[PDB]
Amino acid sequence: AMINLHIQKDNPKIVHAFDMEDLGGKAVYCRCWRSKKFPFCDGAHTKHNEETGDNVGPLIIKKKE
Amino acid sequence: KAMINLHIQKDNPKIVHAFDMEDLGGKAVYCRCWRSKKFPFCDGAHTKHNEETGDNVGPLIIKKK
Ligand code: FES
Ligand code: FES
């Protein structure tokens, strides 16, 4: 069973590379591949966890202050 | 129907990782397939997942400019 079901299925390996300056003060990244704002988290993991019984959540990268 | 995460910290109801940009050093490669033995970091387990399921998931790279 696949993890990603709809994102850029013409791409054989979806990879996102960012410079830390592109994150600003905080970036919240999607790790469930259900977000409408992918690679960013939009809270779609909540609906996925409720329907499948999963426990996935996002990745948060922020500035120290 | 089926879950994304199968074995990582199943006692945790929502797996979230939060880092300061200083904790990344020069480059961090984050897992988005939940198959890595070094989770939240990518160990290349996505290649085996993509080969077996026909998926196209890949990691998230955050680096210094
Ligand atoms: S929407 Fe995918 S982890 Fe939040
Ligand atoms: S091991 Fe999960 S994306 Fe590389």
SS3 of chain B: the string is CCCCCCCCCCCCCCEEEEEEHHHCCCEEEECCCCCCCCCCECCCHHHHHHHHHCCCEEEEEEECC
Q: Which of B51, B52, B13, B18 is CA-nearest to residue A58?
A: B18
- Give the one of B16, B55, B58 whose C-beta lies nearest to A15's C-beta: B58
Documented resolution in Å: 2.4
The rounded distance, in Å, linking the Cα atoms of B14 and B53 is 24
> In this complex, which of B5, B61, B65 lies closest to A54 when CB atoms are compared?
B5
Residues of A in contact with B33 (CB under 8 A): 3
> What is the DSSP secondary structure assignment for residue A20, as one 8-state letter?
G
User: Domains in chain B, ordered, with CATH?
Assistant: 20-65 (3.40.5.90)
